[PDB]
Amino acid sequence: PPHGELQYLGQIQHILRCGVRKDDRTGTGTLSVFGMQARYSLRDEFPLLTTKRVFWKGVLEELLWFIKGSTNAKELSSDFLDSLGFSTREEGDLGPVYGFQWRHFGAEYRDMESDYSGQGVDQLQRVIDTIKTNPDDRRIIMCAWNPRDLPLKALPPCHALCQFYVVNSELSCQLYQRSGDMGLGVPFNIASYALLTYMIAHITGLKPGDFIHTLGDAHIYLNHIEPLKIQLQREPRPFPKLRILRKVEKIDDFKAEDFQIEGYNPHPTIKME
């Protein structure tokens, strides 16, 4: 069949030709198209894009930090409007944001060192438990918020929702994001949610199926246009494979050493602002 990366490349070309000028939050310019979708097979391959080298180590590390439900920024290695707090900012305490919503949804916060077991909804364990109790369920949904929106009394809408789906012993995932930065964020997020799907499939005894990526405001930042035009002239190479190196029981038991990318052979890194 056609290489899955051709979808990404085709969407890039479509925004370049048919996108309309639209400003983002900071009043920076984009070309924008509303509503897009692409399907990447996860069967016997892994959609780490090859037309530029994607920062796989960052993908994997950040996903593990999310799964941990961590609110300590230092734990990551070592859009600055997310502001609040004096000495708390200093410590690297980010407040009740990111994976704190995946694992402790709606739990009253204390500090990043506080022990939140059993506080709030564990959206991720909920999804895994449902896959096990009722694989046919059409409600296998987890949501994630932008920290910026998180007054949260406000009933703020999600930034992204992942719906999982099970048929014939295969697990599929659809990510809906309200906006997608096509040049920087989108290649990263394809790897990240395809990884999440691989991890969930592993622990629930299923095979990965498809990753479907859906966007609302799919945009290209104006200064990404020239690099993206160049990237478009490159020919995708066969996707690599992802290997899980031992049998893992619980989602919290994965560590970066359990994962191996094989046959990854990308074009060179492109630096985008």
Add this chain to the structure above:
Amino acid sequence: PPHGELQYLGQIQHILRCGVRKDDRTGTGTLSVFGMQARYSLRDEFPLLTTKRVFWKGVLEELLWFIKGSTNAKELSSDFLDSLGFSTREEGDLGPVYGFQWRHFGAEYRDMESDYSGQGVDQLQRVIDTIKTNPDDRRIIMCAWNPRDLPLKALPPCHALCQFYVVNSELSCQLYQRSGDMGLGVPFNIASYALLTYMIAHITGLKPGDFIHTLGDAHIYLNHIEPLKIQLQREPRPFPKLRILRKVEKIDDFKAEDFQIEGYNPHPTIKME
């Protein structure tokens, strides 16, 4: 261009050929495909499907009842697991469900006659106010839940989310539904959300743009297969137009008499179980 209804027809054909057998909640069989998307222009036309006659009066009446935030079933004209309550069931009091979430999101309920002004989040007025204060916003999102899931302490996931989008004086809408009954529900919901978009555009001084319809579990009930095969042999006729008959100021001021479908020329009704 190709008639927009060809997308619907093409999705129907794809589920017939490539859908996999999957059971729904009641253990009734479907053919199912996970992840689909279609774009219907709302510019100078209205996507009331023509390959069977769609119940336009029902579409319009139900949408108005939702916009009213009504929990009185009698107010509609005159999946029975949504159960709870003795004399409350009798009165036609449905509890805090449907448009009660659009207009009074998270408000503690009393009874269907109770006066809830200013209680809970008004998701619909929120969306309209944002279109007016910041048309560029990527957070113009309203959500809707299946009444069945609404313990609601449970932080249950939405059944559907609508994201709105504004560029060049045009309002677009993307509906993401976690599951879509392609034979019965989907033609109805295309009309319903395209109508909602028309109404919102009218009051915010914008022109309708696109309606994008995205699904998670897109399915065909087994007993809809023969009628759908027949419907597929029919040639779409040009979409009709929708006319708003007077200038309307507030979303709550629309009534069924303000709307007129023109040039609607469908194939005959198909009865589907």
